[PDB]
Structure formats: C-alpha cells, structure tokens
A paper describes a structure:
The VRC01-class of bNAbs targets a particularly challenging epitope to elicit bNAbs against due to the presence of the CD4bs N-glycans that sterically obstruct interactions between Env and Ab CDRs26. The glycan at position N276gp120 is highly conserved and poses the greatest steric barrier to binding VRC01-class bNAb iGLs, as Ab residues in the iGL CDRL1 that interact with this region are typically 11–12 residues and cannot accommodate the N276gp120 glycan. Mature CD4bs Abs develop shortened or flexible CDRL1s to accommodate this glycan.
In this work, we structurally characterize the binding of two versions of the BG24 iGL to the CD4bs germline-targeting immunogen BG505-SOSIPv4.1-GT13 (hereafter referred to as GT1), to better understand how the BG24 bNAb was elicited and inform VRC01-class immunogen design. Two iGL versions of BG24 Fab constructs were made starting with the VH1-2*02 and VL2-11*01 heavy and light chain germline gene segment sequences: one containing the CDR3s from mature BG24 (BG24iGL-CDR3mat) and the other containing the iGL CDR3s (BG24iGL-CDR3iGL). Cryo-EM structures of BG24iGL-CDR3iGL and BG24iGL-CDR3mat Fabs bound to GT1 were solved at 3.4 and 4.1 Å, respectively. However, for the BG24iGL-CDR3iGL-GT1-10-1074 complex, a distinct 3D class contained two BG24iGL-CDR3iGL Fabs bound to the GT1 Env. The GT1 complexes with BG24iGLs included density for CD4bs N-glycans attached to residues N234gp120, N363gp120, and N392 gp120. The CDRL1 interface with GT1 in the BG24iGL-CDR3iGL and BG24iGL-CDR3mat structures showed the longer CDRL1s in the germline precursor VL domains in different conformations, demonstrating CDRL1 flexibility consistent with cryo-EM data processing.
Author numbering:
A (entry chain M): 1 to 82, 82A, 82B, 82C, 83 to 100, 100A, 100B, 100C, ...
B (entry chain P): 8 to 66, 66A, 66B, 66C, 67 to 95, 95A, 95B, 95C, ...
The structure:
C-alpha cells in the first residue's frame, strides 16, 4: 500500500512562482514514477509533465516549458514550481504515480514496439487561486 | 462534451471519437465530479484493479474494429465522465486525454 499527501499555499499574486509539494509515505522511491496533472473549470484534464529516477524533466510542448519539477529523496517528496503564473490559470492540481508498459507488434530487434504510461494511484489534489486582490 | 442518456437496468456502451491506425492500447478513466479519477481498464483487454465485473472492453484482434466500453447492469452510482486515452503506433506520443462524454441517468 502507498499513501500520498499534497500541500500548497492556495493564494498567490500573479506573475510570481506557484509551488506545490507532494509527499509519499509507506513506500520509497524505488520503482515508482511520478506525474502531475491540472484541471481547470470549463475545460478537460491536462497532462503537464512527469518525472522519475532519471532526472529527465519532459514537459508538454503546449506549455512553453515554464514549470520545473524536482524530487528530493532526503525529505521523501517532490514539488513543482510554475514561474510567471497567469490569473487565468486557476485549476486543481493532482500528484499521481505512473506505471510504464511496452506494446510489441513486430520484431523486437528492429525496434517495432512502443511505450505507454498508465496512472493507477491518484490523489485529492490542491485547489489554488491567483488574483490581484 | 457529448451527452448520452441511459435508463436503469440497461447496458451502456461508450465509444471515444478518436480512431486508431494500427495496434491500439487504450485506457478508460472514470472521473466523478469532485473525486479523483478511477482507472477501469488499462490494457484494453483487462481491468487494472478489482472492481465489479460489469465493465468490459474489446480486445485487439483482427485490426479494423472500434474501441467501445460496455457496462452491464448500470446503477445510479455510474454518473461520471469517461475519458478514452488512445495510444496507437502511427501517431507517436499522445498528450491529450481526448473529448470526454457526459453520462446521464433516466430515473
Ligand atoms: C521471423 O522470426 C522472428 C523472430 O523469431 C519472428 O518475430 C516474432 O514475430 C511475431 C509476429 O508478430 C512477434 O509477435 C508479437 O509478439 C508479442 C509478444 O508479447 C508479449 O507480452 C505479453 C505481456 O507480458 C506476454 O504475455 C506475451 O507472452 C506470450 O505469448 C507467446 C506466444 O505468442 C509466448 O511464447 C510467451 O511466453 C508469452 O506467453 C509476450 O511475451 C505478442 O504480444 C503480439 O501479439 C500481438 O498481435 C496480435 C494480432 O496479430 C494480438 O492479437 C495480440 O494481442 C492482444 O493480446 C495481447 C496479449 O498480451 C495484449 O497485450 C494486446 O494488447 C492485445 O489485447 C498481440 O497484440 C505478437 O504476437 C514476436 O514478438 C517476434 N519475436 C521476436 C523475438 O521478436 C517473425 O515473425 C518471423 N517471421 C516469419 C516467420 O515470417
Ligand atoms: C489488408 O487490408 C484489407 C483492406 O481492408 C483487408 O481486407 C478486406 O477484408 C475485410 C474482411 O472481410 C473486409 O471487411 C474489407 O471490405 C476488405 N477490403 C476491401 C477493400 O474490400 C485485409 O484483411 C488486410 N489483410 C490482412 C492480412 O488483414
């Protein structure tokens, strides 16, 4: 069993840094991927990025790469920081874990396969608001 | 967001709009308003976690068939949004979750 908790300020002035922390208890960072996902009212879900033990911060190309995700094993948690926030970015954030699989359809020595990811465990997520007042 | 209505006791069938070109591996996500999404089917052939044996998907055999999720014996609690995450071989990495559908209950 794995337990995941989240934390965030909630009230940030526009055009600053928005940092949200996600901690894990019960298991270590042995073979557990991590990912973040935001959801804004009026629109569907939006996958923003994922990270693992490879320090390969791959981001969504439709996001301008204005967010950085880090994970420190000493405190046993990760955190994402989005710079230059926009007041129209009010959305609920979720920290989840990812499981990677491979689908094979031909000869493996030629490279006829492709990887995919599936999120099995989710979280409650934080609802943050940004405004000038 | 396309709406679709289902009556009690009937069998519901939900299909996502995106059509695959080659080998497919879809994921069906159920998201209730206010709660975290629940994974139902991950490899388009089997349910990921233990759930009531009511949700079934179509396997990937004899390419040319669509992707549909069927729910037999629907109750009032089956009121949530359904996401069809599509993964094929001739499109690369898929970032968008696709257009979700809105299931409504009669009664
Ligand atoms: C030459 O030579 C070569 C070499 O030898 C060959 O190649 C071959 O080829 C083939 C063709 O295609 C191929 O295939 C493929 O395969 C695969 C594999 O897989 C996998 O994974 C899984 C998971 O884990 C497992 O389970 C399996 O396993 C199996 O089975 C087998 C038998 O078959 C056995 O042996 C083993 O042990 C086991 O048990 C594996 O591992 C597969 O998968 C595929 O399949 C496909 O497609 C089809 C259509 O056609 C379909 O139907 C199927 O399905 C389905 O189901 C599945 C199950 O899993 C799932 O997943 C999915 O999603 C669906 O649902 C599939 O998809 C195929 O079969 C191979 O790979 C190869 N090999 C190598 C090494 O590379 C060739 O062919 C030759 N040529 C001539 C002869 O001409
Ligand atoms: C190669 O592609 C063709 C094109 O679809 C496949 O064939 C056809 O067979 C189907 C099965 O009865 C029919 O529903 C299609 O109408 C028919 N295509 C046409 C243009 O009439 C064929 O099965 C494929 N080959 C393999 C090995 O799957």
């Amino acid at each position: 069993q794995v337990q995941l908790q989240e934390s965030g300020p909630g009230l940030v002035k526009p055009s600053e840094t928005l940092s949200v922390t996600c901690s894990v208890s019960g298991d270590s960072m042995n073979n557990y991927y991590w990912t973040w996902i935001r959801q804004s009212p009026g629109k569907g879900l939006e996958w923003i990025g994922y990270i693992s033990d490879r320090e390969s911060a791959t981001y969504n190309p439709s996001l301008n790469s204005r967010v950085v995700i880090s994970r420190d094993t000493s405190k046993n948690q990760l955190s994402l920081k989005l710079n230059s926030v926009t007041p129209a970015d009010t959305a609920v954030y979720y920290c989840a874990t990812a499981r990677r699989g491979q689908r094979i359809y031909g000869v493996v020595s030629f490279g006829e396969f492709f990887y995919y990811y599936s999120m099995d465990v989710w979280g409650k997520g934080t609802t943050v608001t940004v405004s000038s007042a | 967001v396309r709406p679709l209505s289902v009556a009690l006791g009937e069998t519901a069938r939900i299909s996502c709009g995106r059509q695959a070109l080659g080998s497919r591996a879809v994921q069906w996500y159920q998201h209730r308003p206010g709660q975290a999404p629940i994974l139902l089917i991950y490899n388009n052939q089997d349910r990921p976690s233990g759930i009531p044996e009511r949700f079934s998907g179509t396997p990937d055999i004899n390419f040319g068939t669509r992707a549909t999720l069927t729910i037999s014996g629907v109750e009032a609690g089956d009121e949530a949004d359904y996401y069809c995450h599509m993964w094929d071989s001739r499109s690369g990495f898929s970032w968008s979750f696709g257009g979700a559908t809105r299931l409504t209950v009669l009664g």
